[PDB]
Amino acid sequence: MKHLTTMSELSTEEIKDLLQTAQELKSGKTDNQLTGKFAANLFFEPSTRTRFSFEVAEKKLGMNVLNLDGTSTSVQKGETLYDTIRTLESIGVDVCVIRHSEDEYYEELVSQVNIPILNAGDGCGQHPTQSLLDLMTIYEEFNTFKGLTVSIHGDIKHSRVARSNAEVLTRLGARVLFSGPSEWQDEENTFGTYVSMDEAVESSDVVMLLRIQNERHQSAVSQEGYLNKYGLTVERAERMKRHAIIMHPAPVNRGVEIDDSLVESEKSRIFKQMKNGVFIRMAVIQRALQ
Amino acid sequence: MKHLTTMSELSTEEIKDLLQTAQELKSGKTDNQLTGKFAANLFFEPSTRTRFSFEVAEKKLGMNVLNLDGTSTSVQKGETLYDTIRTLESIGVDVCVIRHSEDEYYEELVSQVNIPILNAGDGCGQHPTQSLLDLMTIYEEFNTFKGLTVSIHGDIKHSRVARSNAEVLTRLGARVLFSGPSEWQDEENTFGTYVSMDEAVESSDVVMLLRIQNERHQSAVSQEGYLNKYGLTVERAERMKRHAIIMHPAPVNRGVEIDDSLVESEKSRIFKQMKNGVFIRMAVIQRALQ
Amino acid sequence: MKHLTTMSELSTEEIKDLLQTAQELKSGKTDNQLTGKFAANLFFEPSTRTRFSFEVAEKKLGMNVLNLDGTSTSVQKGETLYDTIRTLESIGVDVCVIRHSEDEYYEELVSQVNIPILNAGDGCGQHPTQSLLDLMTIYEEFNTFKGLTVSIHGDIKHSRVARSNAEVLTRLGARVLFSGPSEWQDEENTFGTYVSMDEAVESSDVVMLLRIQNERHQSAVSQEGYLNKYGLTVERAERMKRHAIIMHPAPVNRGVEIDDSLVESEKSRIFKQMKNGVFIRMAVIQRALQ
Numbered sequence A, B, C: 001m002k003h004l005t006t007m008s009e010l011s012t013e014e015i016k017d018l019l020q021t022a023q024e025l026k027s028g029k030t031d032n033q034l035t036g037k038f039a040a041n042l043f044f045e046p047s048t049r050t051r052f053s054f055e056v057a058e059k060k061l062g063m064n065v066l067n068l069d070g071t072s073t074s075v076q077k078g079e080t081l082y083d084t085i086r087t088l089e090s091i092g093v094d095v096c097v098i099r100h101s102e103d104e105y106y107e108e109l110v111s112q113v114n115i116p117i118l119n120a121g122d123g124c125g126q127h128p129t130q131s132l133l134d135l136m137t138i139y140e141e142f143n144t145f146k147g148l149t150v151s152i153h154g155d156i157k158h159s160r161v162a163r164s165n166a167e168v169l170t171r172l173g174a175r176v177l178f179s180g181p182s183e184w185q186d187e188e189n190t191f192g193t194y195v196s197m198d199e200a201v202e203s204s205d206v207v208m209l210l211r212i213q214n215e216r217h218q219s220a221v222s223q224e225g226y227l228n229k230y231g232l233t234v235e236r237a238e239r240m241k242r243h244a245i246i247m248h249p250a251p252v253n254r255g256v257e258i259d260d261s262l263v264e265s266e267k268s269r270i271f272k273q274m275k276n277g278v279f280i281r282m283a284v285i286q287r288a289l290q
């Protein structure tokens, strides 16, 4: 039993092992050991990739799957997250995947519950499996992290993606750059140098775009002309290194943080990221259940 | 790869083959060609028959199923339908079933995506699997379409069922009649003769009833005494040909377009339609992935 | 085909049999008689234990599962519950599980539908599988019902649990005590003796707590200090018989009807209830389909 909650508490060796496993499974290697066991997907926030890649991963591992929403479950009757987990243990669930609006919802749980918890996202906190498939995608491309320059752009302080990726990339020996509206920068995220998109887009081996976390803002603010100012425009992408890649955890808001024509251009690895997500998540479930 | 979007682009030959395949599947034919493959059901409008007959179909084919609604997916974050399909492709989905409010949502998709799209309904546009199962049911009854007189009643204007059935029935050599409030007739559906229910009910070999598309009208209008005025009353049903049948795409609004006692009367094939739905949908999936 | 609607129509012999079957199931026994059949779970009210224990039970029986709610189905188009059930029969569903807001929704169905119906809860009416859970857990504890004193506390008026449990308990030879706010007492449930919590907690072999049915009240009222007044406080739990147990159909509102520290205390069988729920529900499904 191993939780996957925060990227900062996962060692370099474990990351290295998870990537190898994921790569092998992607290669065709299979395993049935978990056939018949039960996984529960609890998503209290909207999702497509994370949620359904987990379901695919679970079913490829031969597992039965229970899918829980926040509006149809007894959470409507005031049940706590912990009780929901204990309930799921009681009816035979072996592992739980959770996405929740509350930053660090898992701290209370990991010490109390008896089955592995896989964090599919905690508000603006952590997003471990996104980080892992990001790393995998990067390593597949450059076959190393050391000496890489990776720039993360946009709404940083509301991003569990950036918060997971910045520390671990630095830890793996890469240089991390930030950019975007100064208002949206993170003082709790020092693992990167704040520069401008125009500066970073030329020194970056990786250009990671972020969606604006509109649903997470205290107050809605104008974002007219965001693309020109902060986004990856065609002209900006044309100034990227030959070997550089474009990444984005999705969903993309075409015409906002990236030009519509770039999403599926030569240097884009956005959809490749989604492919790797499945195998990364298969690996993570195996790690969780031994 | 073969999409299924509009009935008007389905050849007479393809139709006949789908009906034959459906019959074989109905009579127990099976194979594991599709076992373990993934099907995704994207339903953005309510549904019971189409959605779940598809799920049953997919599972009888031995497929793994993913169910997406639109309020719990990342469409909520602004993701386009196109990006949603590509996302599903990336994670290993082989076929997508889509029901959407936007007429012809699929026109954009079919030229761009790399997996079969099965249209489960586009606003007031087309509803091909309904048409196919309607044809199957009629064919089981008369072993022919040539010379048949089929009347379609009620809210034609907002009916993707009427749109699909009218063109294809006349194309198959049937005579089509329309009835219902003149206000709800469709000038862009000229494949039938407009008459009154009272006339059509004695001339018809098939009486096809439609539900009022309340949720699709620009503004709500009274519908008091609809049954007596426009609907299939007991008195009207008693004037039907001895060998004529009653059909309805469902759900039925008992007391509106049809008298409560008729839904499961001798001449009714309403539930037989739902039965055929599964096999028609199996056949369509087999066609898409051949 | 044996429906399960209300406890009062379930004989003592049928009950003892379901409990023996659930025990054998709980010990690991299974068979293949239901492999590949279809179960449908129609939940129109929120639920965690009942809905997902049913799904688990179903999967453990080797069945395919269809999950329907209220907002995404064609109930939205005005389809009656009856037509919904008949529709499911037509597409190949062998048994239906239903939780609905309308008391006794099932009495118009039992005489009309052609497949077994399993009531997962009808408004403030009955909750048969919960009751069976309770009986099982109670029987596991004391190995008998005769001579037992069982107290049920709180919002009796709006409890389908209390209604199922009260009669069947006294029928099995146990004495039932009632407790809680006098306004929330039920005149349509006279199978117990109203007393104060402080009294019952000392004379009870089983102390069964109920959640306040806030979502079911015609008018909201204050419930300040509910714990200290009507609930199971730490102080009160200390005065329980040595061999007595705490039960609660869940979910619990920690701090309302029970002190936070008692939910998982030595005398609590609340989570054991959830465990037995699966096997009871397996047994009930086996009974429904012969």
Ligand SMILES: O=C(O)C[C@H](NC(=O)CP(=O)(O)O)C(=O)O
Binding pocket: A046, A047, A048, A049, A050, A051, A121, A127, A130, A160, A161, A210, A211, A212, A249, A250, A251, B074, B077
């Ligand atoms: O939604 C974001 O922009 C980033 C990130 N996106 C994803 O995880 C992909 P999805 O919401 O389709 O599961 C996340 O934090 O949820």
Ligand SMILES: O=C(O)C[C@H](NC(=O)CP(=O)(O)O)C(=O)O
Binding pocket: B046, B047, B048, B049, B050, B051, B121, B127, B130, B160, B161, B210, B211, B249, B250, B251, C074, C077
């Ligand atoms: O909704 C109508 O009345 C006709 C038709 N109905 C169906 O296809 C059946 P369902 O909505 O239960 O899947 C449709 O256009 O969606």
Ligand SMILES: O=C(O)C[C@H](NC(=O)CP(=O)(O)O)C(=O)O
Binding pocket: A074, A077, C046, C047, C048, C049, C050, C051, C121, C127, C130, C160, C161, C210, C211, C212, C249, C250, C251
């Ligand atoms: O809800 C209650 O407090 C009692 C009872 N609770 C249960 O059945 C458990 P659940 O709602 O998680 O399935 C019921 O009537 O729904």
